[PDB]
Curated annotation (Swiss-Prot):
The 2 mature proteins consist of heterodimers of a small and a large chain; disulfide-linked. The chain holds residues 32 to 156 of 258 of the full protein. Residues 46-55, 123-125 form a propeptide. The modification Pyrrolidone carboxylic acid is found at Q56. The keyword Amino-acid biosynthesis does not apply. This is 2S seed storage albumin protein. 2S seed storage proteins. Ric C 3 constitutes the peptidic component of the immunomodulator Inmunoferon. Belongs to the 2S seed storage albumins family.
Length: 125
């Protein structure tokens, strides 16, 4: 009489699965630094240096967490990573009325450090 069928549904946001690992490694603290009160301990056995091995050679173990964080960036998720962090905290945080644009320049602070992605640079892969 008849015979037909077919299934297959999915949903995503960023590329393949950038937003995924992005919310873990890639810009996942640079904006959190300015979002929070001040950088602090976290997950990672790579935090036993004052001057910071993998970070701008200068007393700044705070932004070192962003450099070490952006050090886990892929390449094509670097920019989209900023489109995530520099936004999720905007919707989550009190970033509304006219205090959301102040966060745009703010993230730029850590960007100029070791967060140069979509807040200064562009797609590179």
């Amino acid at each position: 009489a008849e015979f037909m069928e077919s299934k297959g549904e999915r949903e995503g946001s960023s590329s393949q699965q950038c937003r995924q690992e992005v919310q873990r490694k890639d810009l996942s603290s640079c904006e959190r630094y300015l979002r929070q009160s001040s950088s602090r301990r976290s997950t990672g056995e790579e935090v036993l240096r004052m001057p910071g091995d993998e970070n701008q050679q200068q007393e700044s173990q705070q932004l070192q967490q962003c450099c070490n964080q952006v050090k886990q960036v892929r390449d094509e998720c670097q920019c989209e990573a900023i489109k995530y962090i520099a936004e999720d905290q905007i919707q989550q945080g009190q970033l509304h009325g006219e205090e959301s644009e102040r966060v745009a320049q703010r993230a730029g602070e850590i960007v100029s450090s070791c967060g140069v992605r979509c807040m200064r640079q562009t797609r590179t892969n």
